[PDB]
Amino acid sequence: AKAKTRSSRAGLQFPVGRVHRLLRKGNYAERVGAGAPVYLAAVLEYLTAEIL
DNA sequence: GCGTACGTGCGTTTAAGCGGTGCTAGAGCTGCCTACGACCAATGGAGCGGCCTCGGCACCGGGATCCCCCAGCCGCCGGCAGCGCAGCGCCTGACGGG
Numbered sequence A: 001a002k003a004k005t006r007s008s009r010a011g012l013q014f015p016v017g018r019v020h021r022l023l024r025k026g027n028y029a030e031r032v033g034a035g036a037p038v039y040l041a042a043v044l045e046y047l048t049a050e051i052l
Numbered sequence B: 001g002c003g004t005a006c007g008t009g010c011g012t013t014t015a016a017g018c019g020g021t022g023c024t025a026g027a028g029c030t031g032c033c034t035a036c037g038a039c040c041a042a043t044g045g046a047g048c049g050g051c052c053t054c055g056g057c058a059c060c061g062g063g064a065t066c067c068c069c070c071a072g073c074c075g076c077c078g079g080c081a082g083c084g085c086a087g088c089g090c091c092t093g094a095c096g097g098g
Helices: A016-025 A036-049
Strands: none
Touching: A016 A036
16 A cells, blocks of 8 residues: 555645644534545635735 | 805606516425445654754945935016106187177
């Protein structure tokens, strides 16, 4: 078994891994969609790349 | 102090509102289908700490702006007093009239 981060798979730098945890444990819902954190990663990307 | 335009009020007139249909599309709904997301157990590399060295900025001193300021100055004009006189009423000629 060879591992690659979801961060690589979605062409993203913010940690779709870590952002996923803060949803599960951030008490925002009982269950978080598997495609939910990735979409949240990019929308931060465009909202961090834009200011800098 | 100016001044205009908006507050009040009269005379049209028109779209608001009611009350009346009649349609149907879209919401609420149940049943059932199924995949996908939680949970579990191992796993390793990515991320975070504790070092630790270069270099960007900091800090400075100096010289280069570059605005800020104000009489100088001329220019311009307005007021100003003086000037020359146009313009009108009555004075006053021209002269038969009074």
